[PDB]
Write an enzyme that holds these catalytic residues in place. Structure first.
Site, PDB file in Angstrom:
ATOM      1  N   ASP A   1       9.119  18.823  -3.731  1.00  0.00           N
ATOM      2  CA  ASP A   1       7.908  18.793  -3.302  1.00  0.00           C
ATOM      3  C   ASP A   1       7.950  19.019  -1.912  1.00  0.00           C
ATOM      4  O   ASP A   1       6.908  18.761  -1.057  1.00  0.00           O
ATOM      5  CB  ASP A   1       7.184  17.485  -3.767  1.00  0.00           C
ATOM      6  CG  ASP A   1       8.116  16.367  -3.469  1.00  0.00           C
ATOM      7  OD1 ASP A   1       8.869  16.233  -2.643  1.00  0.00           O
ATOM      8  OD2 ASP A   1       7.852  15.455  -4.470  1.00  0.00           O
TER       9      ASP A   1
ATOM     10  N   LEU B   1       2.995  10.722  -4.457  1.00  0.00           N
ATOM     11  CA  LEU B   1       3.284   9.305  -4.022  1.00  0.00           C
ATOM     12  C   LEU B   1       2.185   8.116  -4.460  1.00  0.00           C
ATOM     13  O   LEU B   1       1.962   7.131  -4.238  1.00  0.00           O
ATOM     14  CB  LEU B   1       2.641   9.420  -2.547  1.00  0.00           C
ATOM     15  CG  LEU B   1       4.091   9.259  -1.530  1.00  0.00           C
ATOM     16  CD1 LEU B   1       4.984  10.235  -1.750  1.00  0.00           C
ATOM     17  CD2 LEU B   1       3.370   9.652  -0.065  1.00  0.00           C
TER      18      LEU B   1
ATOM     19  N   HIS C   1     -22.249   0.070  -8.554  1.00  0.00           N
ATOM     20  CA  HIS C   1     -21.370   0.573  -9.476  1.00  0.00           C
ATOM     21  C   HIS C   1     -21.001   1.762  -9.059  1.00  0.00           C
ATOM     22  O   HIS C   1     -21.339   2.500  -7.983  1.00  0.00           O
ATOM     23  CB  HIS C   1     -22.115   0.784 -11.183  1.00  0.00           C
ATOM     24  CG  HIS C   1     -22.646  -0.696 -11.456  1.00  0.00           C
ATOM     25  ND1 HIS C   1     -23.067  -0.687 -12.599  1.00  0.00           N
ATOM     26  CD2 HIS C   1     -22.555  -1.781 -10.963  1.00  0.00           C
ATOM     27  CE1 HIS C   1     -23.304  -1.913 -12.763  1.00  0.00           C
ATOM     28  NE2 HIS C   1     -23.228  -2.686 -11.975  1.00  0.00           N
TER      29      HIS C   1
ATOM     30  N   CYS D   1     -17.425  -1.668  -9.752  1.00  0.00           N
ATOM     31  CA  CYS D   1     -16.457  -0.947 -11.003  1.00  0.00           C
ATOM     32  C   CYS D   1     -15.592  -0.013 -10.183  1.00  0.00           C
ATOM     33  O   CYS D   1     -16.344   1.125  -9.396  1.00  0.00           O
ATOM     34  CB  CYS D   1     -17.059  -0.500 -12.106  1.00  0.00           C
ATOM     35  SG  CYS D   1     -18.219   0.786 -11.841  1.00  0.00           S
TER      36      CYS D   1
ATOM     37  N   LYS E   1     -11.447 -14.248 -17.506  1.00  0.00           N
ATOM     38  CA  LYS E   1     -10.408 -13.278 -17.740  1.00  0.00           C
ATOM     39  C   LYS E   1      -9.464 -13.531 -16.430  1.00  0.00           C
ATOM     40  O   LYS E   1      -9.461 -12.918 -15.571  1.00  0.00           O
ATOM     41  CB  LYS E   1     -11.054 -11.946 -17.469  1.00  0.00           C
ATOM     42  CG  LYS E   1     -11.752 -11.547 -18.776  1.00  0.00           C
ATOM     43  CD  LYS E   1     -12.187  -9.952 -18.828  1.00  0.00           C
ATOM     44  CE  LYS E   1     -11.063  -9.027 -18.779  1.00  0.00           C
ATOM     45  NZ  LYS E   1     -11.543  -7.640 -18.463  1.00  0.00           N
TER      46      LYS E   1
HETATM   47 ZN   LIG Z   1     -20.280  -0.089 -13.023  1.00  0.00          ZN
END
Ligand SMILES: [Zn+2]
Length: 1793
Positions: free
Chosen positions: A284, A515, A652, A697, A763
């Protein structure tokens, strides 16, 4: 290269050590034979360097260590010289590696570029011909295992809250088990004597257990064997690359076992350069572009530096091609003017030949290996190395040792056939049992070794066969050591191994994509595609809930749910305004905005931008209980002063790797929105910095190239558009953060998560990973590129601490335990990297704190010291070259340092680019200037020292530099250079102003051998009060007068400063008493002039005629006879012995009682004819008297001479007034008078009878003849006077006629007694022989007053003006008008004085105390006290009348019954103090003229001293508190009024100062000022030494107090306003000294005690405790402990609980030759928490005792700067000893700040 120099340059008093002999031998052998080439030269100084360490560690306290550490500095320089010596072109080979399968067409096109431009070189692309199906195998295992895991969790995956890590973990379990099946199938077909190639066995395994066909696979091997071979292919198995078996095992381990072709490639890289020439590159990479191709083109401020290099390559390939589909995407947009410019500059060149650069011949050393760089750290994408290069071997040695450690623990774990879950648990447990302090970070980095390449966030390749091995091998070569695991690298050392920038061209379309690390960010989408293929599904990360229901704020819900039920509180300072902006109208972003607001409802606001028109900024009001509203996006009043602007856009994001659209907003689309919102904010706040948060997100903070990556693309747009909008915002103080989730803390204390489900779920792995993944990107300070600020060190610790407690409890999934463990290690590894990568910058406080100023000085000195040593070394300058900091000139490019040769006085100039000398110059001249401008005044001068306020700060550092250059010490050179510079500045002009060679030498010499003290050192007794007067500090002068004991020098000082100290010695009082009494006796009784009895001669025509008539002459002989019949001397009034008038006395002898008579004669006659005598009458015939040629007759011989045995009982005596003479005379016709009978006629007949025919005075010769006249001729005579030990009083005779007087002269011979001489109005020559220089008094009564003669006696009148206005004094001669007293027999007796006395008044006597040697005099008064005070005004007037210039008059008088009086008077202002002891008790009185302005019938004190100077009077002495001997107080006192008494200063010993400190401890009222110091005197009852009770003292502005602790002293000063504060304090313990001085703030500097005698062993410990800070703990800010080279132990005693306030202890981090340095704390390990503020480490001790909160903070500066400084430290507690800081960060609770 120091040969004979080192010895004698490093001396110790001890005899020459044994190991030091070894150093000398090794040091010599490196210089004795330096034959080329380099490898041998390297290994030899390596022996020497090791040899030094052996010594420096064995004899830690030896004085040789400083110079040996200097040698090591020079040895480090040597390694560099050896390297850049042999400059020869490297071999002509290009190395590339492609192993595992078929070479992509993309790679081949990249390599083709090098071969065309570099036709000189020939590419030899490597490949493993026995393994073309390894890559084909890895896919087969991965794909099959991926499918297995999906089917295993098919039900679970459909859940949105499914963490993708449970997939990757469960998959890795299958990957591992499938891998073992291959490794075992391999092991079963190698032992056989027939040997099958690797991909031949792979071919069999693929077709058997998997769905493969051998014909297809064997075809993939064929066309991948011819394709590689046709394109410059060379086999690895065909060439002896793996000649060493240990390396083949490593390579096979990475080729066969784990599918790591990348890690396998790394092994091929090193060996290819070990055997052949060295130019290695990746597939590369690209050739470097000419620097002239785009030289004319400027770089827009819109794009980044890195991208600017990209578009240059992209511009070429768009037309020039060379690549099938090269992506010039970033280049295409919006700049047609520059797009056309790039075309022409490339089209105007030859095709392909000059487009790029050429390597040509690269000259490297036989030792070195040059590696390409990437953002400050090394990366192996490009390599250069001579065959078998020394460093190339070190990297290989590194790699082997890495795997030697890895396999040592991994093999026994792998060996026992366990599943992946339990195999890893064995390996990890095996690792951290052999864990040390040096390999801790290495262990956590190799823990996920098996998981590498199959699970995200697992990169062990770097620490094994990656850059880590290279960087370590570099440190090995630089510092002459072997096997370094993880030690810091300094970019200043990396530069000389850097790949030449003109050839790299690192940044490329492929390299940028190579990378992209395999993180949970990419694992997010890769997992999605796996499920997307497994089932025909759809997007869910946005789809499903993303609605337009723009719900407005429920005030009740936001106030009585979010705000109160919030459990998240942040520790960061609340000086910030938070802009929570909702961008979308889903119920997800809504619930997020209300939660983020709940965390800090009094600092944040809510702006639902999702409603374009109705967009108002909701917030909590100035008061709670209600949510106030406000349009226009603005903010309340109380949030307008905030320094920090925080903004969070909640929305979002697109479901894409590296999103480009946040909330349906492009990169340039949000910038236009941020700009169209920022302007609305400027009217309320002007911040210093801003933080941009991006929540939603698919919003991560990526590792590499944040540029060309949202929101790295966003920071550029906002930067210039925000810095011009909001002023005071630093050009680079703009941080941007990308977060994915919003976290809360529930009612139980568990962190929860708002997912797109719309509910808060627990979570852990998702939450903990996200909180630690978040980064803040900003712009570089050097304007370079985009960098990410280091995460909160106590923050990441707080996360891992949470992880541990999760791992600790049993009620948590083993799947989650496994991932949280990998997370913990990754987090722990991240914290360690900050110390290893040097990413932690020093603390920059918002305000310049006083403690920082000190820290910048200690550091400044260490730099200028070393930089000077390196400067003098590079330019070859001996010890005779003194640097002149005043002469740091600046040429056009470089500075020019002057070095003055201390020998010949010449100077030489050297040029350096280092600006450290220039900066220290400015600082050191400023300090010296502050010192010289503190030695006022201008007129008088050489010590004055009128120090005040801040000037101590400069004085401290200078004095600490001066003392370093202790007399007869060699180093440091810097220490003397400042001392000379200071010296030259104090006693001459600038050192820069001196060019004279002879002058320079003498100056530097005197500067060195003299001692200068610019720093005040506290002494016992009276403190020096800085009270300026007449250009002299009286308080300072007085202190000298108490300390000067040579009474003469004491008198000398009094003459200079014009101050009179009173004397109370009973020896002086008695001396004065005898002197005054003699004058009084002698001056009163009047006496006749010479000569009323003998007769005064009357000059007539140049001859003296004594008498006219015969009757008058007879009367003379009558008087002369009458005289010597009563003796040569007469007694009158039983008081004085007076000689007979005109009786010639030639010598008076007192000790033998005898007298010598001079010559008194009369002419003789001769030749008479007829002589007859009838009736006492002679008859003759004219006998003529000769006139004159005949012998003389003796008149005295005929008189009854009586010489010996006289009565010299009387002490008072008149001096003789008769010079020796011969009487000329004739006769005249005198009738009658026959038979005249007198005592003279008989005497005249006595001459006649004794001299027959020689003398006849009365005779008949036809007429009566007689002696008519009597004319004398005087010959000048001398009267020698021999004295005895007895006391003798003398009067000089007053002689009218000048002829008689001029002939006289006196000569005295002393004998150790008291002698006085009353001077006559008419001067007679006098000489005095001083033996023992006994008492010699002179009464000048008749010569000072007006004199006239009444009836033959003297009458004294009024005083004559200006008589004593001119007085001449010499050791041999004293002249007082009119008399001139000569002095022979002069014993140069410094001690004894001469006294002049006169009676100004009947009762008042004046005494002049004169020293012949000193050529000066003093004034004194004696008489009645009350009578003097009354007539003082006019008797002082008399003294001025006479012409005496003495400013002060002493008063000494002894009364009847022997009671004495002492005191002093000021000639101006007429103020006088008088002291005496009536009835054994002291009595002093303060007078002003005839008025009594103060009294004290009882003055309880000892060592009393009174001082006078104009209006100011000072009384010193020692006082005992409550009559207690231990309670000692020394006081300085000024008397002013009848009641009030001024206090100048006080000294308190250990006992009293302890009473003061205890008084100060409870002094706080809390604030009653300024009656503080006045109240202490009330406690001490200071009035009780005075007589009366009603007294009020006044505390001066310059009042100075000093106490004595058992360790030192502390000097307090009263401030501008009456406020007491510490001026200067200094106490020393056994090992160290502490110093606090006015100016640097209220800080205490702890320094190791420097012993002058260098040869003797030095101390290696520092001691601090809070105990010396008792009482004065209120006056102290912080404590700065500053250790040096010879310090390895810091004892801090922290159990002194008697203070309310405890200063922050700051420990500096200097350089040391020691391996380890320790801080020993006398407290437990618990009670301690740790933190991190920038570069420095913090330990804080909290303890609760005696109902009192105790907080002890300790800050070790810049420890986290690098690994070297981080590992110097160890910490001892009372329970646990020797702890690394890494261990402390791991086992102690952290806290934010
Ligand atoms: Zn979302």
């Amino acid at each position: 290269i120091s040969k004979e120099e080192l010895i004698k340059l490093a001396y110790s008093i001890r005899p020459r050590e044994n190991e030091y002999k070894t150093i000398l031998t090794n040091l010599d052998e490196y210089n004795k034979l330096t034959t080329n080439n380099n490898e041998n030269k390297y290994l030899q100084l390596k022996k020497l360097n090791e040899s030094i360490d052996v010594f420096m560690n064995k004899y830690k306290t030896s004085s040789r260590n400083r110079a040996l550490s200097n040698l090591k500095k020079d040895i480090l320089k040597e390694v560099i010289l050896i390297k850049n010596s042999n400059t020869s072109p490297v071999e002509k080979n290009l190395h590339f590696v492609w192993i595992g399968g078929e070479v992509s067409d993309i790679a081949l096109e990249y390599i083709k570029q090098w071969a065309d431009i570099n036709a000189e070189y020939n590419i030899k692309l490597w490949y493993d011909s026995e393994a073309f199906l390894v890559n084909t195998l890895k896919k087969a295992i991965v794909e099959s295992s991926t499918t297995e895991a999906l089917q295993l969790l098919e039900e679970e995956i459909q859940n949105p809250q499914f963490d993708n890590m449970k997939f990757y973990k469960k998959r890795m379990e299958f990957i591992y088990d499938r891998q073992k099946r291959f490794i075992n199938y391999y092991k079963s077909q190698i032992n056989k004597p027939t040997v099958p190639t690797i991909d031949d066995i792979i071919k069999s395994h693929l077709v058997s257990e998997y769905n493969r066909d051998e014909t297809v696979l064997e075809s993939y091997r064929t066309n991948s064997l011819r394709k590689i071979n046709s394109n410059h292919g060379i086999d690895i198995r065909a060439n002896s690359l793996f000649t060493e078996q240990e390396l083949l095992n490593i390579y096979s381990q990475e080729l066969l076992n784990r599918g790591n072709l990348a890690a396998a490639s790394d092994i091929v890289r090193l060996l290819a350069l070990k055997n052949f020439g060295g130019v290695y590159l990746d597939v590369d990479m690209l050739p470097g572009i000419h620097s002239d191709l785009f030289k004319t083109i400027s770089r827009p401020s819109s794009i980044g530096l890195d991208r600017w290099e990209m578009i240059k390559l992209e511009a070429i390939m768009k037309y020039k091609k060379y690549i099938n589909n090269y992506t010039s995407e970033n280049f295409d947009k919006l700049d047609q003017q520059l797009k056309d410019n790039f075309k022409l500059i490339i089209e105007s060149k030859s095709e392909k030949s000059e487009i790029f650069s050429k390597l040509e011949n690269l000259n490297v050393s036989d030792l070195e290996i040059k590696i390409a760089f990437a953002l400050g750290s090394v990366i192996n994408q490009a390599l250069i190395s001579k065959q078998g290069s020394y460093l190339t071997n070190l990297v290989i040695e590194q790699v082997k040792n890495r795997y030697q450690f890895l396999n040592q623990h991994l093999n026994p774990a792998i060996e026992s056939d366990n599943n992946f879950t339990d195999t890893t648990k064995i390996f990890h447990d095996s690792l951290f049992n052999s864990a040390t302090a040096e390999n801790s970070m290495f262990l956590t980095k190799i823990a996920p070794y098996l998981q590498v390449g199959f699970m995200p966030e697992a990169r062990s390749t770097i620490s094994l066969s990656g850059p880590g091995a290279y960087a370590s091998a570099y440190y090995d070569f630089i510092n002459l050591q072997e096997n370094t695991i993880e030690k810091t690298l300094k970019a200043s050392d990396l530069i000389e191994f850097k790949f030449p920038e003109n050839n790299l061209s690192q940044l490329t379309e492929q390299e940028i994509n190579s990378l992209w690390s395999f993180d949970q960010a990419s694992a997010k989408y890769q997992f999605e595609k796996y499920v997307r293929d497994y089932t025909g599904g759809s997007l869910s990360e946005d789809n499903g809930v993303d609605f337009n229901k723009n719900t407005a704020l429920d005030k009740n819900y936001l106030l009585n749910n979010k705000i109160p039920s919030n459990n998240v509180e942040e520790a960061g300072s609340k000086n910030y305004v938070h802009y929570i902006i909702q961008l979308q109208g889903d119920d997800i972003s809504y619930e997020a905005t209300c939660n983020l607001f709940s965390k800090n409802p009094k600092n944040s606001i809510i702006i639902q931008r999702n409603m374009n028109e109705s967009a108002k900024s909701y917030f909590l009001s100035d008061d709670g209980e209600s949510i106030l509203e406000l349009n226009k996006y603005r903010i309340p009043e109380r949030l307008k002063n905030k320094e920090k602007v925080k903004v969070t856009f909640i929305g979002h994001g697109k479901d894409e790797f590296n999103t480009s659209e946040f909330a349906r907003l492009s990169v340039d689309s949000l910038s236009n929105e941020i700009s169209s919102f920022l302007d609305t904010i400027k009217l309320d706040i002007s911040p210093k910095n801003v933080e941009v948060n991006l929540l939603g997100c698919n919003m991560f903070s990526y590792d590499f190239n944040v540029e060309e990556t949202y929101p790295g693309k966003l920071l550029l747009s906002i930067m210039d558009k925000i810095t011009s909008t909001l002023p005071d915002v630093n050009k680079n103080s703009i941080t941007i953060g990308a977060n994915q989730y919003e976290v809360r803390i529930n009612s139980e204390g568990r962190k929860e998560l708002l997912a797109h489900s719309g509910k808060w779920i627990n979570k852990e792995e998702a939450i903990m990973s996200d909180l630690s993944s978040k980064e803040y990107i900003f712009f570089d300070s050097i304007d370079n590129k985009l960098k990410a600020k280091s995460k909160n060190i106590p923050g990441l610790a707080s996360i891992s601490e949470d992880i541990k407690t999760l791992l600790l409890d049993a009620s948590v999934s083993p799947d989650t335990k496994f991932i949280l463990n990998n997370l913990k290690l990754n987090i722990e590894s991240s914290i360690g990297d900050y110390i290893y990568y040097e990413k932690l910058e020093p603390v920059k406080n918002i305000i310049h704190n006083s403690i920082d100023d000190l820290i910048d000085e200690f550091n400044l000195l260490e730099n200028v010291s070393d930089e000077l040593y390196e400067l003098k070394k590079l330019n070859n300058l001996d010890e005779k070259y003194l640097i002149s900091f005043e002469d740091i000139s600046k040429n056009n490019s470089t500075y020019s340092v002057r070095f003055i040769n201390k020998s010949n006085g010449e100077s030489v100039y050297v040029e350096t680019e280092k600006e450290i000398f220039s900066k220290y110059s400015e600082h050191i001249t400023k300090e010296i200037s502050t010192i010289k401008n503190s030695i006022i005044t201008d007129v008088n001068g050489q010590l004055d020292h009128t120090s005040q306020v801040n000037t101590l700060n400069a004085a401290f550092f200078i004095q600490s530099l001066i003392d370093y250059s202790s007399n007869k010490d060699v180093l440091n050179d810097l220490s003397t250079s400042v001392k000379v510079q200071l010296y030259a500045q104090l006693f001459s002009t600038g050192l820069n102003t001196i060019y004279d060679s002879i002058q320079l030498v003498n100056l530097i010499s005197n500067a060195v051998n003299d001692t200068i003290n610019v720093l005040p050192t506290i002494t016992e007794g009276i403190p020096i009060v800085s009270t300026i007067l007449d250009g002299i500090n009286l308080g300072a002068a007085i202190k000298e007068l108490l300390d000067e004991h040579d009474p003469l020098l004491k008198k000398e000082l009094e003459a200079k400063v014009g101050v009179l100290a009173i004397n109370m010695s009973l020896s002086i009082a008695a001396t004065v008493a005898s002197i005054v009494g003699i004058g009084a006796e002698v001056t009163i009784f009047l006496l006749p002039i010479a000569g009323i009895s003998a007769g005064i001669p009357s000059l007539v025509n140049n001859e003296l005629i004594l008498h006219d008539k015969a009757t008058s002459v007879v009367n003379y002989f009558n008087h002369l006879s009458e005289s010597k019949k009563y003796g040569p001397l007469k007694t009158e009034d039983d008081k004085i012995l007076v000689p007979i008038d005109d009786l010639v006395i030639s010598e008076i002898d007192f000790n033998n009682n005898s007298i010598k008579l001079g010559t008194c004669n009369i002419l003789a006659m001769e030749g008479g004819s007829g002589h007859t005598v009838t009736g006492n009458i002679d008859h003759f015939f004219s006998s003529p008297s000769i006139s004159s040629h005949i012998p003389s007759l003796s008149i005295y011989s005929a008189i009854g001479i009586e010489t010996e045995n006289l009565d010299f009982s009387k002490k008072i005596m008149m001096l003789p007034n008769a010079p020796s003479r011969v009487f000329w005379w004739e006769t005249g016709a005198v009738p009658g008078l026959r038979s005249l009978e007198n005592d003279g006629t008989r005497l005249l007949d006595s001459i006649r009878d004794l001299y027959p025919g020689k003398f006849y005075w009365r005779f008949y010769a036809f007429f009566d003849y007689a002696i008519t006249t009597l004319k004398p001729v005087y010959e000048d005579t001398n009267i020698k006077i021999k004295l005895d030990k007895d006391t003798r009083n003398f009067i000089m005779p007053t002689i009218t006629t000048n002829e008689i007087r001029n002939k006289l002269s006196y000569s005295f011979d002393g004998a150790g007694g008291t002698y006085s001489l009353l001077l006559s109005s008419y001067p007679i020559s006098t000489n005095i022989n001083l033996s023992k220089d006994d008492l010699w008094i002179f009464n000048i009564d008749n010569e000072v007053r007006e004199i006239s003669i009444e009836n033959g006696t003297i009458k004294k009148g009024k005083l004559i003006k200006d008589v004593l206005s001119k007085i001449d004094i010499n050791k041999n001669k004293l002249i007082i008008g009119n008399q001139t007293i000569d002095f022979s027999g002069d014993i140069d007796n410094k001690d004894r004085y001469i006294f002049l006395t006169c009676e100004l008044d009947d009762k008042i006597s004046l005494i002049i105390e004169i020293n012949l040697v000193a050529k000066s005099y003093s004034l004194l008064l004696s008489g009645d006290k009350n009578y003097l005070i009354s007539n003082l005004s006019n008797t002082i007037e008399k003294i001025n009348t006479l012409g005496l210039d003495s400013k002060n008059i002493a008063y000494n008088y002894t009364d009847e019954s022997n009671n004495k009086y002492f005191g002093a008077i000021s000639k101006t202002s007429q103020k006088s103090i008088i002291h005496y002891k009536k009835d054994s008790k002291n009595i002093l009185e303060f007078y002003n003229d005839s008025t009594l302005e103060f009294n004290s019938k009882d003055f309880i004190a000892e060592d009393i001293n009174v001082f006078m100077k104009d209006d100011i009077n000072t009384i010193t002495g020692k006082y005992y508190v409550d009559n207690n001997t231990d309670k000692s107080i020394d006081f300085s006192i000024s008397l002013v009024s009848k009641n009030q008494v001024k206090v100048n200063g006080l000294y308190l010993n250990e006992s009293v100062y302890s009473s003061y400190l205890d008084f100060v401890k409870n002094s706080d009222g809390h604030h009653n000022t300024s009656n503080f110091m006045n109240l202490f005197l009330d406690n001490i009852s200071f009035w009780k030494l005075f007589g009366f009770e009603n007294i009020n003292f006044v505390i001066d502005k310059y009042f100075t107090l000093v106490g004595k602790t058992n360790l030192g002293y502390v000097e307090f000063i009263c401030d501008n306003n009456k406020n007491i504060d510490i001026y200067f304090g200094e106490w020393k313990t056994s090992s160290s000294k502490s110093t606090i001085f006015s100016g640097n703030g209220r800080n205490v500097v702890v320094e190791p005690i420097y012993n002058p005698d260098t040869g003797e062993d030095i101390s290696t410990s520092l001691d601090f405790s809070y105990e010396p800070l008792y009482g004065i703990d209120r006056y102290i800010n912080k404590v700065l402990i500053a250790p040096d080279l010879y310090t390895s132990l810091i004892n801090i005693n922290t159990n002194y609980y008697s203070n309310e306030y405890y200063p922050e202890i700051i420990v500096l981090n200097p350089n040391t030759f020691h391996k380890k340095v320790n801080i020993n704390l006398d407290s437990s390990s618990f009670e301690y928490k740790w933190s991190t503020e920038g570069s420095d480490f913090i330990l804080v001790r909290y303890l609760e005792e005696s109902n009192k909160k105790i907080l002890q903070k300790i800050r070790i500066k810049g420890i986290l700067s690098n690994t070297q400084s981080f590992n110097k430290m160890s910490i001892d507690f009372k329970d646990i000893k020797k702890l690394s800081l890494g261990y402390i960060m791991s086992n102690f609770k952290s806290f934010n700040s």
